[PDB]
């Protein structure tokens, strides 16, 4: 019936220009994979990322809000620049795609009706939007003819009406200042006027400050030489030592001069944010330092008034709310850290957002269905759960989801996870090893307090997730040099089934381990196939389903006394292409399993004793793209079964299936689905708040939660 995007967990890209914040709305927009994630940093219920803007075909690199407007500019490694416009108070849509560039866009800077673009081929362009429509047209572009120079940062400043400055920093030790004038349908008098020198390495961040005092404002530059330089700009009323004068025209005379030097002892300068209207400077560095610099009240020299954090920080943001001011910054794990201060004196850390930075490979709910696990190539296993209760046992108005634990942070290329119990899980990958972990005492009391799972003031901070909420490894299992591809637990939680793929010599094999003694049950299952893509124990544990890349499926009958297996059913032409995923249906529906294949079809297989004893094809359904994930809900909804279907391009479908007929409940709106391959779909056993819950992992970089309302 009704579908809600409950939660989106996606990590922030690691570039210095990826993030920005709307001055009026306080909405944080940052590049996250191919998408632009939107975060309300001060939502009353602590909601994290609530939407991801799709469109770019490669990693988003720059994001900037057009000041005093409803527009937003973004850039990507796809060489494109996109113009977005607000449709409601919180969401935007793409209105223009600039395909003028051949290499990655590196820097952006925006002012009302103006955009400054920097490309990795050396091009610097000025775009101003037409007045009739909202389309942005190329006004003029040029190049700094200094070898293979290309810009790494840009900053615009409106000096007077129709007259602008453009700061350029990149692969050069000098800050280039250009000046142009606004004219009918473009610009003129655009040339480089000054080369502010002083830095000793590449300039990585630039930012002009606004004119609180008419005609006298500041420009801060950050370099890879660990320093920040402050430059004073004046107009008409100007005067070692140096000062770079130039004329924007026969009636405007600018004078720039060095004013202050800061830091120099905390690695590269990652990001610099001025604050409106106070005269303070926020700086993020590459050694995980976030500092506020302001001129002393007595001596006037610049001095650090606040220090936060300690790796590295890439971007930082700054907004004021309720007489306090908030500091944002993203780290190596793609997580946003946040602080709040009455004043530069006191502060406390506020709840942030988190997510993977590389493709999400697998997910798995706990047997109870109260939390979700997800692994990523970013070498982390992450646990997400809803914040249902406050500290007093009262139920929160909205149960927003958060990462409550990071069981693993140093896992080499995991591609599969599965929960043994509510307190233990197993994980594997190309390590050629299978690791199992227990739920520690700390995480326990936290899930019990805020999530209600029975067995501080708010969910964890990034500090606690990186080195306190790790699960202790309890068991090492060796595949004897064979890479793992997937696994499953028997319903009784007494058996592991590990799928190991072929080394192009020996074929695939299924290894069975006991959860009690963690010893292999030695009759290993061989194959005439190379890569098993998914194993699944039947609901009653009687059979072990198998699907392979070479288009086959095979059912292994279980001996309930010896815990051994014997091939009983097989099919060598059930599908035309790779079978990516399979899942059983509730026994109350029958003896049924479903397959999903690269051949774009989902097929249902029901057991029949009639001639012959075998699982035969019952129904099929074709799609537009390859089907990569499928999940049947543990319970039955409206006397039928509920099937979620994930495609290679990110689309998700929800079906109700009865004997011989599929029924499209709905295709999830294109604005809430992932932007790439769904790697796993998993319903949650739990029914809560009259809602079913669906967990999704994708090459998006994201782990997403959806709800479905039935009764």
Bond before 425 cis per omega within 30 degrees: no
305 conformational bin, left if phi > 0, alpha if psi -120 to 50, beta if neither: alpha
Find the DSSP H helices in 348-477: 441-446, 462-467
Query: Sign of the CA dihedral 16, 465, 54, 378?
Result: positive
Question: Which two tokens mark 586?
Answer: 């509730």
Distance CA 407, CA 381 (A): 6
- Measured in angstroms, the resolution is 2.8
Helix (H, G, I), strand (E, B) or coil at 14: coil
Q: Specify whether the CB–CB gap between 463 and 469 falls below 8 A.
A: no
Q: What is the DSSP letter of 549?
A: T
| CA distances from residue 604 to 178, 570, 608, 645 in whole angstroms, order as listed | 66, 15, 13, 13
Q: Which of these, 214, 228, 212, lies nearest to 276 by C-alpha position?
A: 212
Nearby residues of 213 by Cβ (< 8 Å), 6 or more positions away = none
| CA distances from residue 267 to 76, 186, 539, 583 in whole angstroms, order as listed | 26, 40, 56, 51
Distance CA 709, CA 693 (A): 9
Q: Specify whether the CB–CB gap between 374 and 355 falls below 8 A.
A: no
Q: What is the largest CA-CA distance in the chain?
A: 100
Q: Which string of DSSP letters, residue by residue, matches 489-527?
A: E-TTS-EEEEEE---SSS--EEEEEETTT--EEEEEEE-
Distance CA 579, CA 534 (A): 9
Distance CA 560, CA 176 (A): 76
Q: Can you point out the beta strands (E) in 214-335?
A: 216-223, 227-235, 244-249, 252-263, 269-274, 281-285, 289-295, 302-309, 316-321, 324-330
Distance CA 452, CA 447 (A): 6
The 3 state secondary structure assigned to 583-609 is: EECCHHHCCEEEEEECCCEEEEEEEEC
Q: Which of these, 123, 118, 203, 128, lies nearest to 158 by C-alpha position?
A: 128
Estimate to the nearest angstrom the gap between the alpha carbon of 700 and the chain centroid: 7
Q: Specify whether the CB–CB gap between 329 and 313 falls below 8 A.
A: yes
**Using what technique was this structure determined?**
X-ray
Helix (H, G, I), strand (E, B) or coil at 119: strand
Q: What is the DSSP letter of 389?
A: B
- Which string of b and e fits 95-114 if b means at least 16 CB within 10 Å? ebebeebeebbbbbbbbebb
**What number of CA atoms fall less than 13 Å from residue 710's CA on the CB side?**
17
Residue 329, judged by CB atoms within 10 A of its CB (0-12, 13-18, 19+), counts as buried
Q: Which of these, 603, 611, 556, 546, lies nearest to 575 by C-alpha position?
A: 603
Find where tokens 């993030």 sit.
19
């Amino acid at each position: 019936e009704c579908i809600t995007p409950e939660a989106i967990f996606i990590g922030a890209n690691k570039q210095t220009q990826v993030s920005d914040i709307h001055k009026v709305k306080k909405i944080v927009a940052f590049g996250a994979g191919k998408t632009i994630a939107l975060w309300d940093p001060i939502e009353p219920n602590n909601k994290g990322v609530y939407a991801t803007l799709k469109g770019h075909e490669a990693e988003v690199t720059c994001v900037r809000f057009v000041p005093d407007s409803d527009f937003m500019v973004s850039a990507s490694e796809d060489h494109h620049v996109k113009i977005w416009k607000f449709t409601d108070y919180s969401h935007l849509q793409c209105i223009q795609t600039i395909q003028h560039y051949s290499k990655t866009i590196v820097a952006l800077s925006a002012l009302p009706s103006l955009i400054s673009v920097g490309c990795a081929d050396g091009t610097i362009s000025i775009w101003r939007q037409n007045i009739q429509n909202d389309e942005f047209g190329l006004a003029h572009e040029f190049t700094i003819k200094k070898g293979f120079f290309y810009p790494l940062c840009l900053s615009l400043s409106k000096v007077e009406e129709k007259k602008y400055l453009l700061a350029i920093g990149g692969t050069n030790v000098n800050v280039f200042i250009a000046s142009f004038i606004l004219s009918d349908s473009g610009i003129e008098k655009c040339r480089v006027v000054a080369e502010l020198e002083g830095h000793e390495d590449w300039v990585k961040s630039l930012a002009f400050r606004h004119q609180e005092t008419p005609g006298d404002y500041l420009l801060c530059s950050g370099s890879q030489d660990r320093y920040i330089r402050l430059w004073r700009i004046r107009i008409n009323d100007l005067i070692s030592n140096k000062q770079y004068k130039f004329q924007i025209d026969d009636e405007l005379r600018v004078g720039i001069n060095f004013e202050a030097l800061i830091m120099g002892h905390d690695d590269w300068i990652s990001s610099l944010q001025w604050h409106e209207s106070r005269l303070q400077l926020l700086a993020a560095t590459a050694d995980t330092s976030l500092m506020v610099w302001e001129p002393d009240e007595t001596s006037g020299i610049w001095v650090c008034s606040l220090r936060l954090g300690e790796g590295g920080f890439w971007s930082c943001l700054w907004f004021t709310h309720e007489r306090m001011d908030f500091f944002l910054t993203n780290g190596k794990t793609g997580s946003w850290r946040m602080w709040a201060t009455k004043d530069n004196i006191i502060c406390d850390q506020r709840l942030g957002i988190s997510g993977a930075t590389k493709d999400v490979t697998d997910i798995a709910w706990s047997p109870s269905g109260e939390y979700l696990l997800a692994t990523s190539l970013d070498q982390t296993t992450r646990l997400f759960a809803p914040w249902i209760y406050d500290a007093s046992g009262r139920k929160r108005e909205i149960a927003t989801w958060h990462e409550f634990s990071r069981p693993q942070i140093h896992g080499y290329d995991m591609i599969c996870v599965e929960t043994v119990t509510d307190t233990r899980f197993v994980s594997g990958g190309d390590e050629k090893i299978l690791r199992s972990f227990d739920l520690p005492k700390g995480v326990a009391g936290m899930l019990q307090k805020f999530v209600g799972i029975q067995f501080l003031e708010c969910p964890p901070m990034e500090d606690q997730l990186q080195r306190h909420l790790l699960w202790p490894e309890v068991e090492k299992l060796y595949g004897h040099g064979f890479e793992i591809t997937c696994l499953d637990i028997s319903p009784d939680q007494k058996l592991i089934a590990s799928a190991c793929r072929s080394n192009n010599v020996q074929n695939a094999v299924i290894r069975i381990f006991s959860t009690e003694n963690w010893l292999e049950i030695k009759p290993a299952l061989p194959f005439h196939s190379l890569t098993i893509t998914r194993l699944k124990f039947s609901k009653d544990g009687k059979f072990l389903l198998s699907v392979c890349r070479d288009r086959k499926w095979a059912l292994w009958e279980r001996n309930m006394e010896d815990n051994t297996f014997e091939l009983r059913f097989k099919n060598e032409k059930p599908h035309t292409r790779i079978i990516w995923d399979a899942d059983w249906a509730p026994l109350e529906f029958g003896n049924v399993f479903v397959t999903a294949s690269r051949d774009k079809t989902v097929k249902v297989w029901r057991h029949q004793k009639e001639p012959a004893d075998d699982y035969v094809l019952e129904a099929s359904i074709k799609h537009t793209k390859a089907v990569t994930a499928i999940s049947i809900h543990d319970s039955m909804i409206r006397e039928k079964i509920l099937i979620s279907v994930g495609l290679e391009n990110g689309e998700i479908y929800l079906y109700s299936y009865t004997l011989g007929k599929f029924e499209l409940i709905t295709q999830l709106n294109e604005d809430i689905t992932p932007a790439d391959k769904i790697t796993r779909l998993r319903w949650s056993h739990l029914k809560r708040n009259g809602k079913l819950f669906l967990g999704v992992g994708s090459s998006d970089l994201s782990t997403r939660i959806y709800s479905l309302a039935y009764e």
